[PDB]
Every structure is written in C-alpha cells, then in structure tokens.
Design a protein around this nucleic acid. Structure first.
Ligand code: NI
Length: 58
DNA sequence: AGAAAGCCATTAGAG
DNA sequence: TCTCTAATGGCTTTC
C-alpha cells in the first residue's frame, strides 16, 4: 500500500481538537476532514491511534 | 438489528 | 538502517 505523511499543521490541528474531544461524532470528523484535506477514515484512524497513545501515557 | 465505530495487537512505508 | 506513525486485520462494542 501507500502512505501519506501529515504536515506540522495537520498534526497540530488534530492534536488541538484532541484536547477537547477524545472522541468525535460523524459530523465533526467530516468537518475536520474538510478542514485538514483528509478523508473521513484518516480522521477516524488518527483518533484511534492517538487514543492508544493516550492510554499508555495515561 | 447490523452496520459502524471501537479496541488492540501487528505490519510497513516514508524520510 | 533506524525510527515514527500512518494503516492494517480481528475481533468485540456501540447504538
Ligand atoms: Ni448483533
């Protein structure tokens, strides 16, 4: 498969949202997806991984 | 219900 | 070659 590298801007915006909502509703994923020029799935997967990054650091 | 979203462990593509 | 993390597959849980 192929892989896309997320810019400083995209990662920062994602991380910014994560401070407020650890989980996203479907309408908000699509918002961010458009705001960051990412697909819905990428926003879904990102938050999943970041939730995992957050549990270990606790 | 039954898809969609989650959890979680595991790969692998870029730089 | 190494490292970081985007993406994957299996299940189970949500709603
Ligand atoms: Ni069922």
């Amino acid at each position: 498969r192929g892989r896309q590298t997320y810019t400083r801007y995209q990662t920062l915006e994602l991380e910014k949202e994560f401070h407020f909502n650890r989980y996203l509703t479907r309408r908000r994923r699509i918002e961010i997806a458009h705001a960051l020029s990412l697909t819905e799935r990428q926003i879904k997967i990102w938050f999943q991984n970041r939730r995992m990054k957050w549990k270990k650091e606790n």
